[PDB]
Amino acid sequence: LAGLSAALLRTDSFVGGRWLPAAATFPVQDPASGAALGMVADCGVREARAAVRAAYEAFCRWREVSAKERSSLLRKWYNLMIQNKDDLARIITAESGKPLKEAHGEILYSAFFLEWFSEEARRVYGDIIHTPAKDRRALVLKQPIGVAAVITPWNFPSAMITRKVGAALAAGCTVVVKPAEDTPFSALALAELASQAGIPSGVYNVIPCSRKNAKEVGEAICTDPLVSKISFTGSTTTGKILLHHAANSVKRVSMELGGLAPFIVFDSANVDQAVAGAMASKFRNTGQTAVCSNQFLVQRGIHDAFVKAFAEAMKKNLRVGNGFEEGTTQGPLINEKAVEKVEKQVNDAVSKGATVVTGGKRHQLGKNFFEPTLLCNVTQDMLCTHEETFGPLAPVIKFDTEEEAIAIANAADVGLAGYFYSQDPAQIWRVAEQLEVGMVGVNEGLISSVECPFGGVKQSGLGREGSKYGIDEYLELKYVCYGGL
Amino acid sequence: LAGLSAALLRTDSFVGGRWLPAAATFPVQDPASGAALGMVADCGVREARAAVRAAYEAFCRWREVSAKERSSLLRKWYNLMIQNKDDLARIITAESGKPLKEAHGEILYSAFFLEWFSEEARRVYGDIIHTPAKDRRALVLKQPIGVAAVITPWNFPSAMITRKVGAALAAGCTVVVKPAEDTPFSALALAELASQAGIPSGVYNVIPCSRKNAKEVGEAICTDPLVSKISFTGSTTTGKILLHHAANSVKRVSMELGGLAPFIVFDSANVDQAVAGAMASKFRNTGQTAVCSNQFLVQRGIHDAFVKAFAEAMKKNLRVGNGFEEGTTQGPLINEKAVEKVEKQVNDAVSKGATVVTGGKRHQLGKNFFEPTLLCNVTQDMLCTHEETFGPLAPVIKFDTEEEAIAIANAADVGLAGYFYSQDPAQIWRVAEQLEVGMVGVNEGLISSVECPFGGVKQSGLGREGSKYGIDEYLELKYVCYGGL
Amino acid sequence: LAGLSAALLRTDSFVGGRWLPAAATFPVQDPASGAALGMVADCGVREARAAVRAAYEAFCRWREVSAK
Amino acid sequence: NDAVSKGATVVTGGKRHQLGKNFFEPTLLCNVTQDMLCTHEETFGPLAPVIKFDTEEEAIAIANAADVGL
Numbered sequence A, B: 001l002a003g004l005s006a007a008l009l010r011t012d013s014f015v016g017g018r019w020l021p022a023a024a025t026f027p028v029q030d031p032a033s034g035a036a037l038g039m040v041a042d043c044g045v046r047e048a049r050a051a052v053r054a055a056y057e058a059f060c061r062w063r064e065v066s067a068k069e070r071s072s073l074l075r076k077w078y079n080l081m082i083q084n085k086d087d088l089a090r091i092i093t094a095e096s097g098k099p100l101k102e103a104h105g106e107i108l109y110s111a112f113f114l115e116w117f118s119e120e121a122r123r124v125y126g127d128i129i130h131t132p133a134k135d136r137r138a139l140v141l142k143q144p145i146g147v148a149a150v151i152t153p154w155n156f157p158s159a160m161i162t163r164k165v166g167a168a169l170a171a172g173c174t175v176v177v178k179p180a181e182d183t184p185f186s187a188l189a190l191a192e193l194a195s196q197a198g199i200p201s202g203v204y205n206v207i208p209c210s211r212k213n214a215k216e217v218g219e220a221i222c223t224d225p226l227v228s229k230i231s232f233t234g235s236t237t238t239g240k241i242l243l244h245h246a247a248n249s250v251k252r253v254s255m256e257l258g259g260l261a262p263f264i265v266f267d268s269a270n271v272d273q274a275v276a277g278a279m280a281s282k283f284r285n286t287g288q289t290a291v292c293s294n295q296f297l298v299q300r301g302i303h304d305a306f307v308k309a310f311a312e313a314m315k316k317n318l319r320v321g322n323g324f325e326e327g328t329t330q331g332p333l334i335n336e337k338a339v340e341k342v343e344k345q346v347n348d349a350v351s352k353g354a355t356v357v358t359g360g361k362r363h364q365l366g367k368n369f370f371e372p373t374l375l376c377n378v379t380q381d382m383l384c385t386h387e388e389t390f391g392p393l394a395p396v397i398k399f400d401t402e403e404e405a406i407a408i409a410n411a412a413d414v415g416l417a418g419y420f421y422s423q424d425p426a427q428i429w430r431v432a433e434q435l436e437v438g439m440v441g442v443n444e445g446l447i448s449s450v451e452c453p454f455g456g457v458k459q460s461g462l463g464r465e466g467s468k469y470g471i472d473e474y475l476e477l478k479y480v481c482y483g484g485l
Numbered sequence C: 001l002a003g004l005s006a007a008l009l010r011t012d013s014f015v016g017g018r019w020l021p022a023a024a025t026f027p028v029q030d031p032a033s034g035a036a037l038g039m040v041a042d043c044g045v046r047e048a049r050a051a052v053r054a055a056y057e058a059f060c061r062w063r064e065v066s067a068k
Numbered sequence D: 001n002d003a004v005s006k007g008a009t010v011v012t013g014g015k016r017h018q019l020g021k022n023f024f025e026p027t028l029l030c031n032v033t034q035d036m037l038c039t040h041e042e043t044f045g046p047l048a049p050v051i052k053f054d055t056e057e058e059a060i061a062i063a064n065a066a067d068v069g070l
């Protein structure tokens, strides 16, 4: 529970290098025990506009700072995260409910993003191009966009912020962060460290706010003429709303929208491995992530052997309980409406053919705990209105051929992540290239990596985060025609 | 006038490798003489949806074609353009009204884009990234987005299409082109050559339509779920409308929106050169382009000498007349409403201080011809609602300091192109980096180049066309985590 | 019926000394036999405003021409 | 699709023909049930749904189902 570091756990918003409370506040409770965590400032349109101005003014100075200097600050920020990793992780588990171990995993990952972009800052290179004309030279400079509005989800209350903000700052931009009301603390803990690190005032701003204020606040920062860019990770519905906001001022946009995620297991797959991957990919964060494999397409031949091994792994490894409790691998669902969606998806399925192999009802721990569920004999049509239902539920759809498996996977007009196990060299290339998805896992169920491009195709998003391509979402190209020669 | 090549001048739409007429047709007239050029198909929402399907189906096959093959087809298309350059140019002058010489310039430029991207097709490279995990390898593939909706203006009826389409095809995408009603012929002449070149059916589609059908048609193709990308060049107003269209399906977008364009002449500038540049940049296409320097910021010291030399160059070189007429450097304005905007801008200015140095009224040739006008003693506030008034008008605003000149230039929340003449090494870098614009001309007034990145910052656009960055607007990154090692 | 003089029987509008077709056309039929006579340009507000301008500009020169 | 996703079993055909455009593969589905013919009483295409029956009284009862008889 408590015992943290007074400085890391914050309740006020962070604007212009100062902790500022709002007129109102919203409650944040531990999703597992229900305990009150704290009263967080609930910023409104005014606080937002103020935060934007703070960022816009910081930008004009920040863009001037040398890259080697911005790199150094990003690294100091990284080091501070590592030094305080245990507390930072307790905060994640306290508000997201994910197991302490999974929180430790996020903090490292989150830290690695600041570290990674710290290294990118000094590597923004312009070009020198040859043109026919002998009286001129072509130079191409890359410069930061300006101020960016950053809006993140509760899933990875730390990493989701750090992967955008690190790139933003690396390029020379300032940011205004609007964290999820379920998990605002992680965003503010970062702010505390950003000041300890020496990040100049106004570069990193955080404006927490409740569901009520979300619509109004989001509209303010995504509309402000002082904001030139928008970075968002969440549901498609919200994404489209922001894209409309951006459209009025032609703002640069980048986002990731929670799509499905097929997990195709072919006959040539190593079962134990397929299962291990199925385990890791589906039950991490209790199945509450946009990369959590939802539909399992298992081939006839290997089907039965798979489904039986999968379930036996669920019994041997999934221990539902409180995130801080030792030996827990399954935390609670973020809230009630969430539990309602799983139940909904489970019943609708069963009452349409589906066969429950394990789990199936709320866990007898009560509250927001649900039993890890594995249903087989599932069909495609049983995945409607549930394309955005995150929970520890794994529907297994049997398939015959590879053309079929691929046809089903590419069904959705959404494509984020995709997984598949196979021992066929050629099949691996065919499927990997044909899966209209942004990220493909081959014989692996956990593909996280700060040095690789994340994002989706079609309606799953725009742009990419992480890797050598992330910083591009925050730069503008300027062709300079040096003539008169 | 006539005498062209029956095959190059077309009146039907081009869909699926076939010339198809619509239920209705719209007239196209020579903007100079008023002569009837022809009756062009006026496609509606039905023809559009049909063209999209044709493209979507062609895509599934086209994406499969080798890059070396797509490169070869793009080059054959290029060669065909060169072989038919004289006719292709007559067509541009016939519908846009720009001088035959300027049309010859566009055809080469237009051809060079197909040539340039032909070379890019074989150079789309993926990456291999090192990650800590020893049991996995990271691969990054680049694949075409799918079908792209392309909407172009009348200014460069050929080049505007060719710079987007060449990249689109280079990446492996198919396209559906909706040309400007003022200049549809150039788009269809290209289609004729694309079939001669052997471009597979459905890869390049053209759906002409009148003002009436513009709204409906644009909405159809920019909304169709079979279209994954949108490329547009035109006014900001239309751009925002399309961005809203795209927002509903999270479509990839890229566009260029007609901003202003400062032309700052400093005291250290070589007058004759500054003037030569001012001439070329302002009166090319009779001042009807988004890169046409509108406001001239000339420094006190060199002011008077400049304004006097500028005007004397206007008398010695600008000869208003019919584009096909020999010795013509000024064609007509696209239409009546256009002439009305210039007059409007000229009067509003004069009746607010401005002093007319030359020109000022409609040219006594009648119709859509306007006298090249040069007004000095102009002030900033005299540029409202006229930020999108293209015409042979040059308002000269005097300035004192460089901080001032820059402050005024960056005034607009629009930044496309910018120019400035100076002989100060350090001043050149300061201004070039500070001009919040997408392209900067240093001691040069004509910066066109297929191998350099075109586009704008802020509200002037999204993405870039041409150069090594153009093809990026049509690809999607796919991170492939090869695990199980 | 036919056999006239190609030049005398016209289907396009006449503006500014040029024969110009409109986006649409309307049918003209012999009121006695019902036979199709031809498809005539169907000018709209745009063609009209254009014709007015053509006339207004011609006027400024025409008024100058001697009466003789 | 509505059929398959309700029990129907595709014996042949089933998707658009790979000739593209308006060409569809001749399709034969068996294991079809009555209720899978709604809003499709006016869907003309190369599709043949096979509904198994036991008795003649039954066959006739199903055939005369529709309030349409051509």
Ligand SMILES: Nc1ncnc2c1ncn2[C@@H]1O[C@H](COP(=O)(O)OP(=O)(O)O)[C@@H](O)[C@H]1O
Pocket: A151, A152, A153, A154, A155, A178, A179, A180, A181, A210, A211, A214, A215, A216, A217, A218, A219, A233, A234, A235, A236, A237, A238, A239, A241
């Ligand atoms: N209309 C909206 N405008 C702006 N931000 C919004 C809006 N709706 C939700 N958000 C914000 O988006 C983030 C999460 O997006 P949301 O679509 O609610 O996904 P989820 O609940 O699945 O995490 C949160 O920070 C939330 O406050």
Ligand SMILES: Nc1ncnc2c1ncn2[C@@H]1O[C@H](COP(=O)(O)OP(=O)(O)O)[C@@H](O)[C@H]1O
Pocket: B151, B152, B153, B154, B155, B178, B179, B180, B181, B210, B211, B214, B215, B216, B217, B218, B219, B233, B234, B235, B236, B237, B238, B239, B241
């Ligand atoms: N509402 C609209 N929807 C789709 N396309 C449009 C719309 N308005 C104009 N266009 C198209 O955009 C192109 C030119 O854009 P426009 O904003 O009219 O610029 P301009 O007239 O300055 O060239 C033309 O091809 C035109 O038909």
